[PDB]
């Protein structure tokens, strides 16, 4: 469920460039996006239970796109 919420997420962020000329993204800052929240993540710190994890991960996803 999380990689397809992430290729929804990518794909209209792709289409975005659509409605303004400016929002030009590349699939490399989609993939910071991804990995921030994957690694960097503080919320994912001292949390072992992975389905929280997941909760976490794909909540803090959506939001640091």
Known sequence: ????????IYFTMESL???H???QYSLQFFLD???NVLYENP???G?????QRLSII?????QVA
Not at 1 to 8: E, K, N, V
Not at 47 to 51: A, G, L, N, P
């Open 1 to 8: 469920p999380l990689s397809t919420a992430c290729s929804s």
């Open 58 to 62: 794909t909540k803090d996803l959506f």
């Open 43 to 45: 919320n994912l710190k």
């Open 33 to 35: 996006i991804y990995h």
């Open 21 to 23: 000329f400016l929002y």
């Open 47 to 51: 949390v072992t239970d992975h389905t």
């Open 17 to 19: 460039k659509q409605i």
